[PDB]
């Protein structure tokens, strides 16, 4: 874990999700509301501007509900990315956010990578604010995790 201030809170939150993913995925499937309410996410929530925390949470919880209803747990990187923004008490709105800001305002883009959140499909590792957060499991049938074939030449 990192210790530098707000940046560390962000890095460590995603590290925690990755380290606990095999539990988190099951809670997200079976009892997501409970998952969203874990005190684990309180520090992250404090990085989200107070005036918009609730709106972001309404957006992400709704998106997750719609996601889960039609797709289930397919999208690991996206579930991990958005999960901490579900932590605040939700305030529902009709606003569709393309990005979500944290105070470190830096933007996490909803689709795809950003300076803040950068998943690489070749190494299968997540990078947050230029720091390693760990290895993601996109395919739950995979035995070997991490870097793809044909990366190291020899």
Numbering used by the authors: 537 to 640, 644 to 693
Provide the authors' original text about this structure.
Each segment is packaged in a ribonucleoprotein complex (RNP) together with the nucleoprotein (NP) and the three subunits (PA, PB1 and PB2) of the trimeric RNA-dependent RNA polymerase, which mediates viral transcription and replication in the host cell nucleus.
PB2 residues 538–676 form a compact, highly ordered domain with a novel fold as indicated by the lack of structural homologues found by DALI. The N-terminal half (residues 538–623) comprises a 6 helical cluster with a hydrophobic core rich in aromatic residues. In the crystal, the C-terminal extension of the domain (residues 676–693) exhibits an extended conformation which is determined by the crystal packing. The domain fold is unlike any other known protein so the structure in itself does not shed light on the functional role of residue 627, although its exposed surface location suggests it might mediate an interaction with another viral or host protein. The high resolution crystal structure of this domain from a human influenza A strain and of the K627E variant, shows that it has a novel fold with Lys/Glu627 exposed to the solvent.
